[PDB]
DNA sequence: TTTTTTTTTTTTGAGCGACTGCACTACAACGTTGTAGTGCAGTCGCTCTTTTTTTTGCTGGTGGTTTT
């Protein structure tokens, strides 16, 4: 890539510290590692070093040895830095991938987690068949929610893939609630887990709606999951030191353990979460497959549900319908047999269909860009609308697009109305953008939102105050004292009393904060596709930037496409929408080298 | 080029010198035994200051703060 070429000094500074006085070619190695760490690979091929360099023929003559040194097994093993596993060497190679030494225990960890220790619990069938003919409604067809949750609730780890809008909460509440009724006189200690906490507080408000609907009894109402913990809290992360209190000696005394969003989980966390189960807790990872990335390097969740395509076992599959009594199809082929039946595919959206183009541009995200250009060209949908960004007039048309869709916001905030409608109102219309600075970016388009808020008559914003009545802001830390998360809106106003900060809190109620109490502050007016995760817009609006840059990718399209319930406006040009779908960000790993033996 | 989380403390005196108890042999009183002197080991008090010393250019010299 082109940020791939500017080398970082963490990288060169590394490879300095590591090879040394060796080879030339075990420097290169370390700083293209370190670099291909950097950016989120987990693993590095032999064969790209050994082709897209051209320092390859210099470092070949620079080694003189008897064998030559022509492989780069030979020649990275030949030095101290380099070896297969047993000694403590920062760099490993044990499958012709080099990685470094952390990377490959973590890989390793995975791949014995879910390989080996993956086993069937073995249950009673009829009285699962039963709970979930009462707990499913629908039994005239082929339904992929209760294929998920009787996949989850016979083996102990599985993966549930499925995108948003697709009921994937109603599916872990139907799986909780077949599980307390399948073991009654066993308790159940269920456990949640979140990666942020505003998406533990959505879990948590989603879970308690979900569950207070479905008929339950007095024991049973009290073996129901009490909250939904961060990762980073629930093993005990330190601020100052990374030291949990779970961390290989004593486990975490949980009998079932759900894991939402697994996308934003990255392979350290993995492996940390992974190193505190103990062995007969059954563990549900949640997320979706063709989602955004993790935050730090690493990429799980995507090569975990790639096996998911090739299908079931053949065997499972008539499980699967003698659990479910219905006709579940077969997977062609066997490679790895547990991992394919671990996972599980949702298809069936239920709060969208074929009849609205927003899931159909969502499938043809993964496919090429011509289909869907041809999903945005015929009809569009009544949903999909496309506006060209080239030049300033562009620019005008798309910012009175935007005051339409801030219309009601603005009508509510100048009717001095009550906060909870203008929250309602905010949270329908959201634009997303990828960069931060500049003209095409978050602070670019804040800045240029309150200047043509100054410039028509709908805000009033004093040049000094910096607290004007109707700035919405966000938090980018979190405080467990204010009750506030990290991605939470609020919005600024005189009640009477001042002006105030009011949030909306996931328990139905308002909250007004100081804005002196506020610990971060950050303009929201349109938001990061990575900060946006989790949350839902019924009105949203892309906006792509006009230069090419690595973060606008198929990925990012995709969560843009899949956060809007209804709408969904888009303002880019035609060859960055075409570029961005066939550039996918692929983070290269030794789990599917690992997954096939 | 983007971005995630997190609130639990800990520990710290040792050498010098005496008190007391049990073992251990030397030697005189009445072969054996009681009294005396010393060695070794467990247990315990105790105790660890005091303080102040200065040259530096007021504007030393074409120097000089502030409004359009």
Redesign the pocket.
């Known amino acids: 890539a082109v ?1 791939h070429k500017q080398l970082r000094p963490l990288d060169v500074q590394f490879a300095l510290t590591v090879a040394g006085d060796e080879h030339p070619a075990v420097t290169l190695a370390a700083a293209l590692l370190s670099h291909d760490a ?2 989120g690979h987990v693993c590095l091929p032999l064969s790209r070093l050994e082709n897209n360099e051209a320092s390859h023929p210099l470092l070949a003559t620079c080694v003189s040895e008897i064998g030559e040194l022509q492989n780069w097994e030979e020649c990275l093993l030949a030095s101290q830095a380099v070896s297969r596993g047993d000694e403590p060497t920062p760099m490993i190679l044990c499958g012709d991938r080099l990685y470094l030494n952390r990377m490959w225990c973590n890989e390793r960890t995975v791949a014995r987690f879910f390989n080996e220790v993956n086993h069937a619990i073995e249950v009673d069938e009829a009285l699962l068949a039963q709970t979930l003919d009462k707990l499913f409604p629908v039994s005239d067809e082929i339904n992929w929610q209760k294929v998920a949750a009787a996949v989850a609730l016979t083996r102990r780890i599985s993966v549930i893939s499925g995108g948003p809008g697709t009921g994937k909460t109603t599916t872990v509440a139907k799986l909780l609630a077949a599980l307390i009724q399948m073991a009654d006189g066993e308790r159940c200690r269920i456990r949640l887990a979140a ?4 998406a533990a507080a959505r879990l948590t408000e989603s879970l308690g709606k979900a569950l207070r609907q479905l008929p339950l009894t007095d024991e049973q109402k009290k073996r129901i999951p009490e909250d939904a913990s ?1 990762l ?2 629930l093993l005990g ?5 990374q030291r949990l209190r779970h961390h290989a000696g004593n486990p975490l005394h949980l009998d079932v353990l759900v894991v939402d969003e697994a996308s934003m989980i ?1 392979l350290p966390m993995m492996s940390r979460l992974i190193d505190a189960l103990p062995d007969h807790a059954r563990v549900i990872f949640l997320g979706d497959r063709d989602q955004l990335a993790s ?2 390097a690493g990429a799980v969740l995507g090569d975990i549900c790639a096996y998911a395509n090739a299908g079931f076992t053949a065997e499972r599959a008539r499980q699967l319908s003698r659990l479910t009594g219905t006709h579940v199809p077969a997977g062609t082929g066997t490679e790895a047999a547990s991992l394919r039946d671990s996972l599980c595919l949702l298809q069936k959206s239920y709060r969208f269909g074929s009849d609205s183009g927003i899931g159909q541009l969502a499938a043809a995200i993964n496919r090429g860009d011509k289909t869907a250009v041809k999903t945005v060209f015929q009809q569009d949908f009544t949903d999909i609308e496309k506006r060209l960004l080239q030049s300033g007039e562009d620019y005008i048309a798309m910012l009175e697009e935007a005051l339409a869709g801030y219309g009601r916001y603005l009508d509510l905030l100048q009717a001095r109305a009550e906060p909870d409608l203008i929250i309602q109102a905010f949270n329908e219309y959201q634009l997303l953008c990828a ?3 500049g003209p095409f ?1 978050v602070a670019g388009l804040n800045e240029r939102i309150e200047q043509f808020m100054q410039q028509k008559r709908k805000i009033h914003r004093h040049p000094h105050s910096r607290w004007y009545e109707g700035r919405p802001v966000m938090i ?3 405080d ?1 004292a204010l009750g506030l ?3 939470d809106i609020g919005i600024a106003l005189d009640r009477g009393q001042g002006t105030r900060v009011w949030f909306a809190m996931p328990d139905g109620n308002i909250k007004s904060v100081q804005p002196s109490r506020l610990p971060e502050h950050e303009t929201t007016w349109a938001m ?1 596709v ?2 946006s995760q989790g949350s839902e817009f019924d009105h949203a609006a892309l906006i792509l930037p006009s ?1 090419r ?3 606008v990718t198929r990925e990012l399209v995709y969560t843009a496409v899949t956060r809007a319930r209804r709408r969904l406006s888009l303002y880019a040009d035609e060859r960055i929408l075409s570029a961005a779908i066939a550039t996918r960000t692929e983070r290269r790993s030794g789990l599917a080298a690992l997954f096939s033996s």
């Open positions: 940020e950097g950016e990666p942020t906490g505003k961060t980073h809290r992360a330190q601020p100052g030191s990255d935050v730090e960069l931060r600075e970016g980018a830390r979190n467990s998360f990290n991605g990061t990575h900060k230069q840059t690595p973060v």
